[PDB]
């Protein structure tokens, strides 16, 4: 029905919006088992009257594992969870520009090999 | 000294490390007026006993307008500041794998027609 | 009549002495409006038993604009004023050499790349 | 660390880091007696409103003697110290150029015949 | 960037400086995973008003073990940690030479057959 | 009886064991004053069920002065003491392996111009 797509490069992952207010809405991978399927979480509130709008994203990439093929019955399970939340904050009145730039910003600020770098390999950003 | 650049097409605007604390660490473009200057926050903790490791990213962007040639005898002032925090957290065993798919998921789920959508018009995700 | 002359690179800024009290001169750079002109206002006191002097250097440049030309009936007034005061504490029987090493060091240490970008962009003295 | 080198003349003394609060830092010169060594305190405060800005240095230097050569069971002590202060107070909403300018004078204010004559000799600023 | 080396005979191993207060540094040796990654830290403060200076060194050699190798899913993890830390205490007047003795012997108090044996071995001192 | 020696390039001081309890055992170099005489307080104890064993080491330099020279009729007094302990901290089962290396480690360690240098100059690590 209503989904989201994202390319890893060659791959491609697409999520379904399983639950939904419009409130908040919440999207999952089904595909591997019911667990772990990489999870999504949207959100929208409005802080004070009129001040501003707050959006939220969570996002739980969950590592599982199956080992039902090589210890006698137990099954898959969670080694953890990784995650990457955002808490963007805009203003009512901002300029349909303002708001653009922030956008660009981040996009591209995100995908610089110093970020990444960081992120996996724990490298202070900076150079 | 140490820096970060930033692609808004053709346009490119670089950020400076002014200082470097414990957990602390900030980035600015100095330049332009001194209070209308875009901050980036960037910190580094680890709760626990070494158990997990949070990063921490605030983005912050204050639309600042100067009315000197307007009216004469007037100087820069800020009308409101927009943000963008990301709250990622990693396990301190992770596979350089999970951690490098987790950045390449956000970086491309940004780069989203959709995401850009919903930050710019506030349009729910969903296709 | 008591002058003195600074070289702003190129340029040769002149301050003159505008009044003499017993303990404290006074200069204001004789030019441009008669109500925002450079300030400079040089104390000098002895500490109780003649232990010690303490110098005091004070210095006041107003950012001034003249609206005569674009608003009818406006006259030059002060936007702001931006202030360097200086505490020098000698004692009395200080070696001769004690006393200039001091100067000197204050000297390079402002011509300093970090105190200037500290000073003009607010950058922290890391490096 | 974070350090800073100044010129004096020929030789160059270095200023290492000794501590860091979220105002203010703090230099001392490492080498000689660990008695009386250079020293330098940067703070950083805010005003009111967030009207101005106000920085603070302090430098102070000690005289010490080493009298282990002719007095037997004497050790290095301090004389004296002798200091000197800033205290810039800097607008916000300030020019760029109308900042520098304001660096610029004082530095080429300090490197002053008339200025050293004074600090040194206590020569008032006539001429 | 700030580094630290040692050499165990042969082999080498690097430190690099990982977090930073003037007040007290950390070094890590970013090369196995994340965990267990060889740690060691600094520090420094001031008993009392100038009548001392204590410095401390801990160095934490956990001993780490992957075996997704050969059992089903299970990461690399840490089995215990040795430690090693020092406390040394300098008085803030002494002699130049006064320290020099006690690093020279400590020095070679380490590198004593006698010291290894003792702690890898657990056998008596004194021989 | 059973003794220490220490090389300082070619000056050899001795130590002497003149105690030795249950969980204490002390050395020191007898000649000389009384007071002024190098102590080497050893220890090893093992909190809870043999879980862990912790070690021990205490290093006492006193500076005396004898005036005997200067002042007839006088005798040698204590100016000050500076120390240097350790606490090692070992896991019942590691590994000779584990055990060994650490020790190795420290050795080259302390002999470094880094740690030199900070101990007597007090200059923070890493190059």
Not at 20 to 23: I, K, L, N, V
Not at 37 to 40: F, I, P, S, T, V
Not at 95 to 102: H, I, P, V
């Given at each position: 029905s209503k989904t989201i797509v994202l390319s890893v490069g060659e791959a491609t992952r697409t999520l379904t919006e399983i639950q939904?207010?419009?409130?908040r809405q919440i999207f999952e991978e089904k595909v591997?088992?019911?667990v772990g399927?990489?999870?999504?979480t949207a959100s929208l509130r409005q802080n004070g009257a009129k001040t501003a709008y707050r959006v939220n994203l969570?996002?739980?990439?969950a590592d599982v594992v199956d080992c039902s093929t090589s210890v006698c019955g137990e099954l898959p399970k969670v080694r953890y969870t990784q995650v990457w939340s955002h808490d963007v904050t805009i203003v009512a009145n901002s300029?349909?520009?303002?708001?653009?730039?922030?956008y660009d910003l981040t996009k591209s600020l995100?995908?610089?090999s110093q970020v990444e770098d960081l992120v996996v390999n724990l490298?202070?950003?900076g150079r």
């Open positions: 939904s207010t419009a409130d591997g088992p019911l399927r990489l999870r999504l969570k996002l739980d990439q300029t349909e520009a303002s708001r653009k730039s922030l995100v995908a610089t490298v202070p950003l």
